Structure formats: structure tokens, C-alpha cells
Design an enzyme around this catalytic site. Structure first.
Site, PDB file in Angstrom:
ATOM      1  N   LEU A 189       0.817  -1.217   0.000  1.00 46.58           N
ATOM      2  CA  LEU A 189       0.000   0.000   0.000  1.00 46.58           C
ATOM      3  C   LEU A 189       0.846   1.260   0.000  1.00 46.58           C
ATOM      4  CD1 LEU A 189      -2.921  -0.969   2.451  1.00 46.58           C
ATOM      5  CD2 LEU A 189      -2.851  -1.160  -0.030  1.00 46.58           C
ATOM      6  N   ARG A 204       5.040   3.102   1.502  1.00 44.14           N
ATOM      7  CA  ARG A 204       6.290   3.066   2.238  1.00 44.14           C
ATOM      8  C   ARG A 204       6.614   4.460   2.699  1.00 44.14           C
ATOM      9  NH1 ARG A 204      10.356  -0.412  -0.717  1.00 44.14           N
ATOM     10  NH2 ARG A 204      11.370   1.444  -1.587  1.00 44.14           N
ATOM     11  N   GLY A 205       6.734   4.609   4.012  1.00 45.15           N
ATOM     12  CA  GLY A 205       7.073   5.868   4.657  1.00 45.15           C
ATOM     13  C   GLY A 205       8.505   5.848   5.125  1.00 45.15           C
ATOM     14  N   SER A 240       8.336   2.762   7.956  1.00 45.23           N
ATOM     15  CA  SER A 240       7.713   1.464   7.645  1.00 45.23           C
ATOM     16  C   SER A 240       7.271   1.256   6.201  1.00 45.23           C
ATOM     17  CB  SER A 240       6.524   1.228   8.575  1.00 45.23           C
ATOM     18  OG  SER A 240       5.478   2.139   8.289  1.00 45.23           O
ATOM     19  N   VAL A 260       4.000  -0.530   4.290  1.00 46.48           N
ATOM     20  CA  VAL A 260       2.617  -0.844   4.633  1.00 46.48           C
ATOM     21  C   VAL A 260       2.003  -1.755   3.606  1.00 46.48           C
ATOM     22  CG1 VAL A 260       0.369   0.154   5.274  1.00 46.48           C
ATOM     23  CG2 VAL A 260       2.469   1.384   5.859  1.00 46.48           C
ATOM     24  N   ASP A 317       0.734  14.161  15.186  1.00 44.82           N
ATOM     25  CA  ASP A 317       0.811  14.066  13.735  1.00 44.82           C
ATOM     26  C   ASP A 317      -0.599  14.077  13.137  1.00 44.82           C
ATOM     27  OD1 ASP A 317       2.190  14.090  11.359  1.00 44.82           O
ATOM     28  OD2 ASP A 317       2.433  11.890  11.291  1.00 44.82           O
TER      29      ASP A 317
END
Ligand SMILES: Nc1ncnc2c1ncn2[C@@H]1O[C@H](COP(=O)(O)OP(=O)(O)OP(=O)(O)O)[C@@H](O)[C@H]1O
Ligand SMILES: Clc1cc2[nH]cc(Cc3nnn[nH]3)c2cc1Br
Ligand SMILES: Clc1cc2[nH]cc(Cc3nnn[nH]3)c2cc1Br
Length: 327
Positions: free
Chosen positions: A43, A45-46, A49, A51, A154
Site C-alpha cells: 500500500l 512506504r514511509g 515502515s 505498509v 501528527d
């Protein structure tokens, strides 16, 4: 140096709880079985992490797996403890499991899946009633986590998942969330640029839950005025200038004076002098359907430089703006 500050609500929630509640470093993680989960698709990528959408093969239900990057071990334990403390709270994302990923060899957080409506779609289509309805739902999440001694830090559109079909909302991504301890100095490098409170921008570290109320006000302003983002800074410095062009420089300097803050001298050549603009300046034919005197009064009480002067989440829930929302 700077004058200290403390939250006007939930000040001592953490002092009166056992050390196990907030001492996330001493928390022993209960590990689930990674074989219960079959990854379906990536889904995103940050920074911390990757996802995935997955299936829990023990019940054939959809889940979301956040595979953490092998960095900052204390950060991982903080998020897990916060998710555990808040589990079952109104509109808080449910942490379903914690497993050790077989590939990355790092922790993988398993969450309830939210069939969330597209964020662009949400911003473009919410009616006046739906903005009030969903704002009330976000406040239930914020009052709960603040009442539990936690600040999210956040709050922004991408961290608020709405299943518009079931009129269901979830506040996600607790990776920057922190336990509030009176007198504690926190990192100002939190939240996304456009949602950063003036406390962060002027480098005031003794902040509290009221940072989340500023972020919520930024969301509200963007929704009612149809201006995404409402405060569109080119960087963290210009971000404060953008705020000052709306709220004025006089109240900014009063805020810096009150808390005895040493403003970065780089602001001397860019802040200029600005007077507060009345909220009606931002009303136009394309947003008038979302604006009311109640919306403006409520926004006015969230977007204040002085973090101690903002409505708390419970006060915000008492506001006339929500009188039309069915309860
Ligand atoms: N519980 C969940 N249910 C459904 N989708 C989820 C859930 N948690 C996260 N997601 C989705 O997984 C993706 C995660 O990828 P990523 O963090 O890179 O995206 P993002 O929303 O643009 O993040 P940000 O803007 O904060 O950097 C997002 O599209 C997010 O909406
Ligand atoms: C929250 C966020 C964090 N970001 C980085 C660290 C730890 C670190 N220091 N130097 N490199 N990594 C960290 C801890 C916590 Br709690
Ligand atoms: C509640 C949650 C939301 N998640 C994303 C949006 C869209 C948006 N764009 N700028 N601020 N919000 C949104 C609106 C409401 Br009300």
C-alpha cells in the site's frame, strides 16, 4: 530562558497511573504468529515502515501490516505501548497483533483494515453537515487519547481514515505519539509542515495536547475555506510567516514575550508586520456553503498562537458548531 508551561487538562494523568502504563521501554511485547497473515499488496512506504494490505487467514478478514524499518528501537516500543493503551477507545485504530516479520526480521504491526475513501474525494465532496459530523468524530479520538495522557503529534488528513459508506472514522499512525509528562521538553521536529503548531515553529519544547488542537484547526480551515493546505509555507520558517499573515504579528510577539522565547534571528528579515485578518476575508462564492458564524467562531478558538488559550477537545465538543450534529 523560556518560561515553563503545563497542560490545563489531564496534567497528571501519567503520574497517577502505574509506571508500566507510560514506561514503554520496560514493556515486554507479546508476539503473535506471523503465519496467520498473508501479504496481499504493498500500500505504501514511509520513513519508518512499509505498509501492506493482508489477510488474516484464521478468520479470512482484511488487515493492514506495517513492517517497521530497523531503526530507533525505543520509538517502536513507544508506538506499541500507545496503541495498546488506547485500544478500544473511540475512533482509535485497533492494533490487532504484533508479529516478527520473517524477511525484515523487525516488528510488524497488524491493524484492523479500514476501507477508506480517497482523501482527495473526502476533501472535494464533504458537505457542511459531514465536516461537522467528522470533526466531532475526530474530537472523540483526541479527547480520548489526551484523557489517556497521550498526544498524537501528527494530526493531518492522511492520518484520519474515513469509511464514508459506514460513516466510520479512525485516527491512525501513532508512530509520533508521546506520553505527556508535565515539565517535559519534547522534540519540535514532529507533525507535518503545514500542520505544525506555532510552538514547534518558534522552538518551544514544553508543549502538550493543545498541539493536536492547532493541527485540527488547520484541517478545519482547509475544509471550510477549500484551501489545501490552509497555511502553505515554502519551509518551516515561511510556515510561521504564512500564519502571521492571517493571525498577525502583534499576538505572535505577545506569545514569544509571555513564554520568554528567543525567536530565531532568521525571522527578523522575513516576518514583517501584519495585522490579524477577519475570518470573512477568506470566504468566497466557492466555499460560502461550508461557512457559518459557528464554524468561524470555532476555528477562531483553535487557531491561537498561545497553546494554553486553544479550546481543549472536550471544550471543542461543547461548541455550537456541533449543535446540528445528531448525537
Ligand atoms: N488501517 C488501515 N486500513 C487501510 N489502509 C491503511 C491503514 N493504515 C494505513 N493505510 C494506508 O496504507 C498506506 C500507507 O502508505 P504511506 O504511509 O506511505 O501513505 P501516506 O498516507 O501518503 O502517508 P504520509 O502522507 O503520512 O507520508 C496509505 O495509503 C494509508 O491510507
Ligand atoms: C522516538 C523517535 C526517535 N527517532 C530516533 C530515535 C533514536 C535515535 N537516535 N539516534 N538515532 N536514532 C527515536 C526515539 C524515539 Br522514543
Ligand atoms: C476529516 C478527516 C479527513 N481526512 C482527510 C480530509 C480532507 C482534508 N483536507 N484538508 N483537511 N482535511 C478530512 C476531512 C475531515 Br472533516
Amino acid at each position: 530562558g523560556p518560561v515553563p508551561s503545563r497542560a490545563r487538562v489531564y496534567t497528571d494523568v501519567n503520574t497517577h497511573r502505574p509506571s508500566e502504563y507510560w514506561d514503554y521501554e520496560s514493556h515486554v511485547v507479546e508476539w503473535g504468529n506471523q503465519d496467520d497473515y498473508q501479504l496481499v499488496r504493498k500500500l505504501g512506504r514511509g520513513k519508518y515502515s512499509e505498509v501492506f494490505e493482508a489477510i488474516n487467514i484464521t478468520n479470512n478478514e482484511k488487515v493492514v501490516v506495517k513492517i517497521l524499518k530497523p531503526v530507533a528501537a525505543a520509538k517502536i516500543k513507544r508506538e506499541i505501548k500507545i496503541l495498546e493503551n488506547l485500544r478500544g477507545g473511540p475512533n482509535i485504530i485497533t492494533l490487532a497483533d504484533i508479529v516478527k516479520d520473517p524477511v525484515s526480521r523487525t516488528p510488524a504491526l497488524v491493524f484492523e483494515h479500514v476501507n477508506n475513501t480517497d482523501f482527495k474525494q473526502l476533501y472535494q465532496t464533504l458537505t457542511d453537515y459531514d465536516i461537522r459530523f467528522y470533526m466531532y468524530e475526530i474530537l472523540k479520538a483526541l479527547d480520548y487519547c489526551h484523557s489517556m495522557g497521550i498526544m498524537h503529534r501528527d494530526v493531518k488528513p492522511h492520518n484520519v481514515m474515513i469509511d464514508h459508506e459506514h460513516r466510520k472514522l479512525r485516527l491512525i499512525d501513532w508512530g509520533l505519539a508521546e506520553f505527556y509528562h508535565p515539565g517535559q521538553e519534547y522534540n519540535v521536529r514532529v507533525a507535518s509542515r503545514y500542520f505544525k503548531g506555532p510552538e514547534l515553529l518558534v522552538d518551544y519544547q514544553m508543549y502538550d495536547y493543545s498541539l493536536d488542537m492547532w493541527s485540527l484547526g488547520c484541517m478545519l480551515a482547509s475544509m471550510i475555506f477549500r484551501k489545501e493546505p490552509f497555511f502553505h509555507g515554502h519551509d518551516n520558517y515561511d510556515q510561521l510567516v504564512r500564519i502571521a499573515k492571517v493571525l498577525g504579528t502583534e499576538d505572535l510577539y505577545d506569545y514569544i514575550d509571555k513564554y520568554n522565547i528567543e525567536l530565531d534571528p532568521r525571522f527578523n528579515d522575513i516576518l514583517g508586520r501584519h495585522s490579524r485578518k477577519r475570518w470573512e476575508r477568506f470566504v468566497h462564492s466557492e466555499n460560502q456553503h461550508l461557512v457559518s458564524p459557528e464554524a468561524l467562531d470555532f476555528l477562531d478558538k483553535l487557531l491561537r498562537y498561545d497553546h494554553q488559550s486553544r479550546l481543549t477537545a472536550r471544550e471543542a465538543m461543547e461548541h455550537p458548531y456541533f449543535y446540528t450534529v445528531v448525537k
